[PDB]
Design a protein around this nucleic acid. Structure first.
Ligand code: MG
Ligand code: MG
Ligand code: MG
Ligand code: MG
Ligand code: MG
Ligand code: MG
Ligand code: MG
Ligand code: MG
Ligand code: MG
Ligand code: MG
Ligand code: MG
Ligand code: MG
Ligand code: MG
Ligand code: MG
Ligand code: MG
Ligand code: MG
Ligand code: MG
Ligand code: MG
Ligand code: MG
Ligand code: MG
Ligand code: MG
Ligand code: MG
Ligand code: MG
Ligand code: MG
Ligand code: MG
Ligand code: MG
Ligand code: MG
Ligand code: MG
Ligand code: MG
Ligand code: MG
Ligand code: MG
Ligand code: MG
Ligand code: MG
Ligand code: MG
Ligand code: MG
Ligand code: MG
Lengths: 68, 231, 56, 252, 120
RNA sequence: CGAAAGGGAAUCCGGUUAAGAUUCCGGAACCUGGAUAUGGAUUCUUCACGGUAACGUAACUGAAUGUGGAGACGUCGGCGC
RNA sequence: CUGACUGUCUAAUUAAAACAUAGCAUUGCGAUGGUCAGAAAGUGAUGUUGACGCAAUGUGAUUUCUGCCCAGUGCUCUGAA
RNA sequence: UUACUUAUUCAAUGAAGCGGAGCUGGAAUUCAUUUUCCACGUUCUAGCAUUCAAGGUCCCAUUCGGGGCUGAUCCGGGUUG
């Protein structure tokens, strides 16, 4: 299934593809509020992994803390 | 008529309160408007790697509408159809024999991303349509080249919303047929032939080219001006 | 005093002329004159700078 | 040691400006189509006095380019200006005292008040009683006109920045001796709790580094290095020299 | 196509704005009327200072609820006793009780009405 | 939210108690919000006359919008009342 | 002898000659800044401000002057390296 | 040493008139052509400037009410620095 291609993609974090995705999305996130509800996991292969089943009553939230 | 006069307005600087023109350009739109507007825009400058620039290549209205009217002939079982088929098959076959094979071997469109993948993986599929708008894009980026290596004819179609209702859903991402009744295999070729000359033989050459740029309007005519004028 | 004028009759809050309250007699005379001379001399500005039109 | 006075001023509290009696802040007109392109008349409705600011303020009423209404802007009265004057503002304006023109649009040698650093900040330079910048020259290499500010520092700004012809009214304010102490008391009553000033060599060593005694002297140098720490900056700071000079003229 | 916006300003588009259609009705059975008449007017204030008021003044002096108001006082004197109430006057006693003075219209005799209520 | 000393819709004399009163009694007012009718005014030149004028009067239709005024303002001093 | 003066302070042992003052002199700064505040900050004072300004030291009305020294401490620099 | 504008940074505005090009029209070169320049509502006055605008032109049979296109050139949706 498609997940093993998400897992393996997600591990080439300096591949030119991801860098570009890393860029565009790290920009998108800054603009929305610091805690904002997530329409749907950016990483479906991973939210799956850590427990998330894509069903009612599961909730994914994105968040931004401050480094250092 | 000469009892009405023709008193004309000036609307130049320093006189005549300006007339309600149109401000759609100058609207201070909601934040969530600009974000989606500016993410595409951002994704328009900066060079785009090819494996994402592979998309944008959608399809012509014609082969699209061709490949749809074809796929439309293989809808899944609807609710009340699987309903009665099971009141039919289950009730009688378990009151007799024919291991549930109380029904014709079906010919549906097949969908579900992991699923359509294991198809392509196993060389069981015949024509795969990948939507050009999935998010994240990684959900699909491997397909165009996963397809190519298995040699499974693919094509990057327009509408994750179309393929959806094409498989009786809100959205679908992928839709790909492996079977098809024998009365159709002829349109198969003429569709795969013309496609496999846009999404297949083109692949190798296409992945060698990135996208992005497009200074947008102002700064581009300004370089269209520095060039035209200063040369 | 201000709210007391709301318990009183319009003849107590005006004279009978352009700008009842608001402006004072001579301030409306100057209002008038200035108005008349400006709009007149406007045309004068127009006709004259239409003589310089058909001059060139 | 204690917290010396000049640090206690940063938080606010007692030292914040007294502003009750102040007419609205002085600012030019916002840089609109009109001024960016043509000009726009206005009448000085009155010239008024803004507390603790010797320098009269001018009130100029401009019809609204876009809606039926009047917008009163608050200018600093540039001397010569007079109730009833007409103030024209904008690239195309003419060269008269009181009008506000971009720095591009004025010849060299024009002296000019309330000029903007960055075009459209509504006024930055020479807003003090009787001050004025001077245009020293232009340079079409980005609309940047070179001007001389009242310090004498000739700093380049963008010729799209606006000014207002003439010099700031309120001429020789600081030529009259304040004489007695009350005069000065009232001066700052309308400004900020800055006065009187105690010398720190009166203090004890805890409220100032000049502090301790047995003899009112300063101790070591009274020139402190640009990059000392607050609590040691008191005295002549980055003093690149000291002593009497009579300097004559400035930087040209 | 497009759309003509004469206002640079975007505003929250007016939306439906429904209306509460429950499914289990908050309270079970609404409260009975707190401050009924007998609750309003609490007790007659029979003191020689106040008797002389009923005698030579046509005033009925009742202690009343603190929640009560002038309107409510005039009401329940008027219903419980079948009398017209010129005007009501309330002062809050030092022990927290709300003494109300009620003058009855020239129709009714407050002294009659008084040993009518049963007290002299 | 922040003034029982700032801004602020309108009450007065007489009388009364052992102790309350610009509250109570007696008389005479005024403000506000709400109601509505009659008298008047206006009108065939429909939305009033007069006075050269400053202005007058028992009135004398006025939505948006604009604007102007009152609220609203230091201190001393001599002079007038 | 002292401090120019009016003025301020050790509530409860010091009212002075001390502190302040006006006046004089000096220093930093043109906002991408000077000084100062904050754990941080889409933070804050000066600032409704812009050198006739704000900030920081000295001396202490007027008059009259304000010499010599840049080696040391320190501050400063369109300076060789 | 430096061009880019999307990250980041700062200024304003009730995100109005930015950017490219066109009507109109007055001069030019070229030994004729488009090869470009240029301009295109306000300055004796302490008035007035608002009702999707009067005009113009199409519609509904139009009884009074509406509406549209010009009036206000078009094309980019980079609010503007
Ligand atoms: Mg959901
Ligand atoms: Mg940290
Ligand atoms: Mg089904
Ligand atoms: Mg300390
Ligand atoms: Mg303040
Ligand atoms: Mg004020
Ligand atoms: Mg002097
Ligand atoms: Mg203060
Ligand atoms: Mg003080
Ligand atoms: Mg001093
Ligand atoms: Mg001192
Ligand atoms: Mg001491
Ligand atoms: Mg110390
Ligand atoms: Mg030290
Ligand atoms: Mg000393
Ligand atoms: Mg009471
Ligand atoms: Mg309050
Ligand atoms: Mg009434
Ligand atoms: Mg006013
Ligand atoms: Mg007051
Ligand atoms: Mg006054
Ligand atoms: Mg002696
Ligand atoms: Mg003394
Ligand atoms: Mg003294
Ligand atoms: Mg003592
Ligand atoms: Mg002792
Ligand atoms: Mg003493
Ligand atoms: Mg010194
Ligand atoms: Mg002293
Ligand atoms: Mg001296
Ligand atoms: Mg010396
Ligand atoms: Mg000598
Ligand atoms: Mg030395
Ligand atoms: Mg040396
Ligand atoms: Mg050095
Ligand atoms: Mg803008």
């Amino acid at each position: 299934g498609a997940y093993k291609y998400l897992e393996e993609l997600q591990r080439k974090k300096q591949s030119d593809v991801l860098r570009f995705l890393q860029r565009v999305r790290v920009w998108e996130y800054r603009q929305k509020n610091v805690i904002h509800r997530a329409a749907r996991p950016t990483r479906p292969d991973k939210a799956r992994r850590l427990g998330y089943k894509a069903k009612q009553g599961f909730v994914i939230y994105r968040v931004r803390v401050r480094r250092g | 008529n000469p009892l009405t006069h023709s008193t004309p307005k000036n609307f130049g600087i320093g006189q005549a309160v300006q007339p309600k023109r149109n401000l759609s350009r100058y609207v201070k739109w909601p934040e969530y408007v600009r974000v989606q507007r500016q993410k595409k825009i951002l994704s328009i400058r900066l060079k785009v790697p090819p494996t994402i620039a592979q998309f944008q290549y959608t399809l012509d209205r014609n082969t699209a509408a061709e490949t749809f009217k074809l796929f439309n002939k293989y809808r899944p079982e609807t609710a009340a159809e699987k309903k009665e088929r099971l009141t039919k098959e289950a009730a009688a076959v378990a009151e007799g024999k024919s291991k549930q094979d109380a029904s014709p071997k079906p010919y549906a469109v097949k969908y579900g991303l992991n699923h359509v993948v294991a198809l392509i993986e196993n060389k069981k599929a015949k024509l795969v349509l990948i939507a050009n708008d999935v998010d994240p894009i990684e959900l699909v980026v491997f397909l165009p080249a996963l397809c190519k290596k298995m040699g499974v004819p693919y094509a990057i179609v327009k509408g994750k919303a179309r393929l959806g209702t094409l498989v009786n859903q809100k959205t679908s991402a992928v839709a790909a047929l492996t079977e098809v009744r024998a009365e159709d295999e002829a349109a198969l070729a003429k569709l795969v032939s013309t496609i496999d000359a846009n999404f297949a033989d083109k692949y190798d050459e296409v992945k060698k080219h990135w996208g992005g740029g497009i200074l947008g309007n102002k700064a581009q005519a300004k370089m269209d001006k520095x060039x035209x004028x200063x040369x | 005093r201000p709210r007391q004028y709301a318990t009183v009759s319009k003849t107590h809050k005006t004279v009978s002329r352009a700008y009842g309250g608001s402006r004072c007699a001579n301030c409306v005379k100057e209002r008038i004159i200035r108005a008349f001379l400006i709009e007149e001399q406007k045309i004068v500005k127009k006709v004259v700078k239409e003589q310089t039109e058909a001059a060139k | 040691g204690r917290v010396i006075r000049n640090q206690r001023k940063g938080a606010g509290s007692i030292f914040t400006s007294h502003t009750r009696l102040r007419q609205g802040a002085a600012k030019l007109r916002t840089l609109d189509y009109a001024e960016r392109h043509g000009y726009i008349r206005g009448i000085v409705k009155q010239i008024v006095h803004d507390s603790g600011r010797g320098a009269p303020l001018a009130k100029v009423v401009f019809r609204d380019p876009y809606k039926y209404r009047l917008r009163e802007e608050i200018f600093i009265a540039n001397e010569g200006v007079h109730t009833g004057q007409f103030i024209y503002a904008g690239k195309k304006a003419s060269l008269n005292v009181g009008n506000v023109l971009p720095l591009g649009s004025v010849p060299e040698g024009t002296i000019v008040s309330n000029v903007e650093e960055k075009p459209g900040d509504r006024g930055a330079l020479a807003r003090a009683s009787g001050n004025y910048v001077i245009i020293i020259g232009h340079n079409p290499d980005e609309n940047k006109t070179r001007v001389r500010l009242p310090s004498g520092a000739k700093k380049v700004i963008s010729s799209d920045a606006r000014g207002v012809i003439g010099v700031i009214a309120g001429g020789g304010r600081v030529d009259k001796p304040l004489l007695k102490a009350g005069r000065a008391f009232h001066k700052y009553r309308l400004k900020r709790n800055s006065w009187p000033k105690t010398r720190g060599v009166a203090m004890n060593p805890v409220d100032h580094p000049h502090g301790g005694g047995n003899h009112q002297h300063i101790g070591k140098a009274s020139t402190i290095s640009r990059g000392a720490v607050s609590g040691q900056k008191a005295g002549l700071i980055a003093a690149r020299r000291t002593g009497l000079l009579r300097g004559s003229q400035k930087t040209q | 196509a497009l759309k003509v916006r004469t206002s640079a300003t975007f505003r929250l588009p007016k939306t439906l704005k429904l209306a509460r259609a429950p499914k289990y009705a908050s309270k079970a059975v609404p409260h009975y009327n707190r401050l009924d008449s007998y609750k309003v007017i609490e007790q007659p204030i029979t003191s020689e200072t106040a008797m002389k008021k009923v005698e030579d003044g046509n005033i009925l002096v009742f202690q009343v609820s603190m929640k009560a108001n002038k309107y409510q006082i005039k009401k329940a004197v008027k219903e419980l006793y079948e009398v017209d109430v010129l005007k009501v006057n309330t002062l809050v006693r030092p022990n927290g009780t709300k003494k109300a003075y009620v003058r009855l219209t020239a129709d009714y005799d407050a002294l009659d009405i008084a040993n009518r209520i049963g007290y002299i």
